[PDB]
Every structure is written in C-alpha cells, then in structure tokens.
C-alpha cells in the first residue's frame, strides 16, 4: 500500500543562502584548520568557534 | 571552448528526502538561468 496526498503548487523563488550552525550555551565547536586533512585522524591546528 | 551539456527540466522527481516520488508543476515561461561554482565532485571506484 501507498499513501498519496496532493497540495497546491504556487511556484516560489528558490535561491539557497548560507546557513550556519551555532553551539548552545555550555558548548563550543572545535575546528580543523589544517590545509591538508583527509577527513579523519589527528588535525594538528585546532581553533574554537561558536 | 564552451563544453555544452544537454539538460532537461523535469516534473517527476525521485525525492532525496526519503523513498517516494513527487510531481512538480510544469516549467515557467521566461528565461531561467543560473551561474554556479563547481567546488567539488563525488566520485566512485569499483573492484
């Protein structure tokens, strides 16, 4: 079985904007600043951002 | 210069949101374009 719905289709403008994520109070985000980083393992230059 | 890709605008879309299909309204009359920056690729390799 399937479930099918329909909706009104006004067309809308669609142009993605940058969205950033921010730490809640009590937390912080560590960031890897290496020029070379393969996605895993130790990063030797780390900074903290919100 | 100017490698051209053949593109089509479609109404029946397989959703990325989950498994399922969806129909969208037909194309807009007028001129539609976008200029984008290619910043990366998704590549795969087999055995």
């Amino acid at each position, epitope marked *: 079985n399937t479930s099918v719905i*329909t909706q009104a289709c006004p067309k809308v403008s669609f142009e993605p904007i940058p969205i950033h994520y921010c730490a809640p109070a009590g937390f912080a985000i560590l960031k890897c600043n290496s020029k070379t980083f393969n996605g895993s393992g130790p990063c030797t230059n780390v900074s903290t951002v919100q | 210069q100017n490698i051209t890709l053949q593109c089509r605008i479609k109404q*029946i879309i397989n959703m990325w949101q989950g498994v399922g299909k969806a129909m969208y309204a037909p194309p807009i009359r007028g001129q539609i374009r976008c200029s984008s920056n290619i910043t990366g690729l998704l590549l795969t390799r087999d055995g």
Partner: antibody, heavy 125, light 106 residues
Framework: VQLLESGAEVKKPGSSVKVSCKAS????????FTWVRQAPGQGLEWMGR????????HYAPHLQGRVTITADKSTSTVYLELRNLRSDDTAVYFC?????????????????????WGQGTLVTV | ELELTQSPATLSVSPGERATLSCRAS??????LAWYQQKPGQAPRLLIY???TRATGVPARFSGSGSGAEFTLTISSLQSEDFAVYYC???????????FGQGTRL
C-alpha cells in the same frame, strides 16, 4: 491514439457499473485520462481524472463517495466504476485523454485538455 | 463551486457569417480553458485549447481570445457542418475540479 468503449448496461438502483476503455496506437502510460458523463438532454459532466504514471486519481465533489477510476497499466485499459448507483445516473459515459510529452522520462505536463475521445456507452439504472 | 455558462442559449447565425460564442466562469480561468464541438451521435471534439490555440486539424475558421473569467470563441465564415452545440471547459483547479458548461446551440 483511439479510445475504445465497452458495451451498454442496465442496472437497478443500489447496484454498480464498471465501464472499461481500451487505449491504443501509442504507449498507454504517457496518456492522462478522464471520464465525462452526459445524461440525455444535459451538457457534459466531468466525473474524474486519472494519472497513469503515478497511480493517482480525483473525482468531482458529488462522486467522491461513489466513483473509482483505475488504470490497468498492463492492458492499457481504464476503468470507471460507479457505486451506489441511482436512476439519476442514467447517462452516456465516455473516456477521453491527452498525451504527456515524454512522461516516461519524468516530463509529464499535467495536461487538462481532451484530444482523444471514445464513442459513448449507454448505461441505464 | 465552478460553473461555466454561455451568454446565448442558442446562437442564431447563417452560413458565411462569423459566429460569436461567449463563455463566463464563476471562477477565474486565467487562460486554462478549452472549447469543444458536439454534434449528435459524435464525440465532443476539441478545437481550441489554451487561451485560443488551435488543435491540429482544426479549421482556420476557429479562433478566439479572452482573460480572467470571460472568453470568446468565433467561427469565421461559418459552414453548415459547424452548426453544433459548443461547450466551454475550465480545468485550472488543483486538485482537479474541472467542469464543462451548459453549452450553446448553433
């Protein structure tokens, strides 16, 4: 595309009628279909619409609890089923449809016009 | 709800004249309209669809214009074979709630 109607029928109120329509001459799945009714002395009445690429259908407000439209994708046949049938439903029934450019490839245009028509099937109640 | 009516119940015209038919809707159409020609014993063949675009195979006689909820169909140089009942169809509802009007007789 040609649309081929089924035979005439006679029912009593409280029963039901299911009328087939065979569509041929092109690939079935690329055509959208509707059903239209016309009681003698009356104008045309839209009953409903079926999308064949996505099995989805809609019915006119007074038929929502009475009508089901089915597209049999394997036989290229559309069926109109009317339930809880009344003498008020005596009419000539017929199928119609229209081509959706490259619907198979996802270019379906939701075309609301009817170009291909059946002959008219008389159903009395 | 959606209903379409014609101005004339019947249209009194002679062959060779330009017949004028006029459809009015209870709801805005915004060019999503079509016209059909109904003869006794025949399917209601589509002649005009989308504002006034002629369907393939439609005589040049058939043409028209319109906007909003008021649309006109005309038949130039009307022939005797064109003395049909014409129907106006509106299909711009979604979910579909398409209708045909009462029509008019030539």
């Amino acid at each position: 595309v040609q649309l081929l109607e089924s035979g005439a029928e006679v029912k009593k109120p409280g029963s039901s009628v299911k009328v087939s329509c065979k569509a041929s001459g092109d690939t079935f799945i690329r055509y959208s279909f509707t059903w239209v009714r016309q009681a003698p002395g009356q104008g045309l009445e839209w009953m409903g619409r079926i999308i064949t690429i996505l099995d989805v259908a809609h019915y006119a407000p007074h038929l929502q609890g009475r009508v089901t439209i089915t597209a049999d994708k394997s036989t290229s046949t559309v069926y109109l089923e009317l339930r809880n049938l009344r003498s008020d439903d005596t009419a000539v029934y017929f199928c119609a449809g229209v081509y959706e450019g490259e619907a198979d490839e996802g270019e379906y245009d939701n075309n609301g016009f009817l170009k291909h028509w059946g002959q008219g099937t008389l159903v009395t109640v | 709800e959606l209903e379409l009516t014609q101005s004339p119940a019947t249209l009194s015209v002679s062959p060779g004249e330009r017949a004028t038919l006029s459809c009015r809707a209870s709801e805005s159409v915004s060019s999503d309209l079509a016209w059909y020609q109904q003869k006794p014993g025949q399917a209601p063949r589509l002649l005009i669809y989308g504002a006034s675009t002629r369907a393939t195979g439609v005589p040049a006689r058939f043409s028209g214009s319109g906007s909003g909820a008021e649309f006109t169909l005309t038949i130039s140089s009307l022939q005797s074979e064109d003395f049909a009942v014409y129907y106006c169809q509106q299909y711009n509802n979604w979910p579909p709630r398409y209708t045909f009007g009462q029509g008019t007789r030539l």
